[PDB]
């Protein structure tokens, strides 16, 4: 049984400005098997009613999913994506960085 660990990118849909309405994305890809847990966090707390794309896959058979929710960036709030998968001993957390 192959187990491929997810690649993670956390980013905004539109260029970010403090106080301006936007969308936070967590894109997970390159993983196998398909079962995965993805949460979007605001200051360490789970954001509710985050949505996700329908499961699909690339040529190498690895899966990809986009998770997303509306958000308004500010200077003080920290955003993140938390991913768990059979390949991870503990949840992986990737912080949202405006510049990436």
């Amino acid at each position: 049984m192959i187990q491929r660990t997810p690649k993670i990118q956390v980013y905004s849909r539109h260029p970010a400005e403090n106080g301006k309405s936007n969308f936070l994305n967590c894109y997970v890809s390159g993983f196998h098997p398909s079962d995965i847990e993805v949460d979007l966090l605001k200051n360490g707390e789970r954001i509710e009613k985050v949505e996700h794309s329908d499961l699909s896959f690339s040529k190498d058979w690895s899966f990809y999913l986009l998770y997303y929710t509306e958000f308004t960036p500010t200077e003080k709030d920290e955003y993140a994506c938390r991913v768990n998968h059979v390949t991870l001993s503990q949840p992986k957390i990737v912080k949202w960085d405006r510049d990436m």
Binding site: M1, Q9, Y11, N25, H32, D54, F57, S62, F63, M100
Partner: protein
Amino acid sequence: GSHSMRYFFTSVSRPGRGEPRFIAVGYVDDTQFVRFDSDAASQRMEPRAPWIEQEGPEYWDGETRKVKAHSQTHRVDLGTLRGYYNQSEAGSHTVQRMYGCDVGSDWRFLRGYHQYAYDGKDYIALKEDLRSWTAADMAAQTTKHKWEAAHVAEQLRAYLEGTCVEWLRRYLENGKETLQRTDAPKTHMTHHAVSDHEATLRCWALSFYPAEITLTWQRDGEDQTQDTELVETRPAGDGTFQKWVAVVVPSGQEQRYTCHVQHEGLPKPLTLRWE
């Protein structure tokens, strides 16, 4: 101006109780237009693009019947392949299938595909001529012999060269407003000082469609790949895509570095510089 139609299917067994989780999605180029999820309440093929909502009740009835039949086939396959591989009834396993057609700028048949994987590894696939099979191991070879005896390739060929192309052309016309529109990348560069000696230049491409793009750096007009980082192209969530490439440079030497952008939506490639 070449195009593709592709369907993707994932079935995942649930050994403790009931039928596999089945998810099917259809794409034209980089645009998803239909879906089925066995976990959802409708038990219908559902629209995901405005231009497919033009299709009437007969369309939706037919696609629902078909996708349900596809789900049954993969359910059976999960059991068959478990047998071929001598695996226990205890573990969860996965089958994945992709099929579809490419057309050229003339919107006529160019290439067909029909490929199948078990637990994320190549199992069996139609060869490019659509007349013979590539089987990865002796289990897949058992399937190949079966499909050869039943002349499966000929039935698949007929769809790939005919029905697939005919409907791709219909969708392209019906969704002209978006499917035949190219969205050129919106580009910009950012700069970050890491130390007194080192800076990062990041070249952004945003809001582009289709997903295919090339982003490169040059130093004094020569290709530069050392000290660069290129992220995988990612969805914006509105149907368009994003990408960036970055380079680490000596502070003060930013002017030597140019970013180069190639995309179908740009007449000539773009060249960016830090200002």
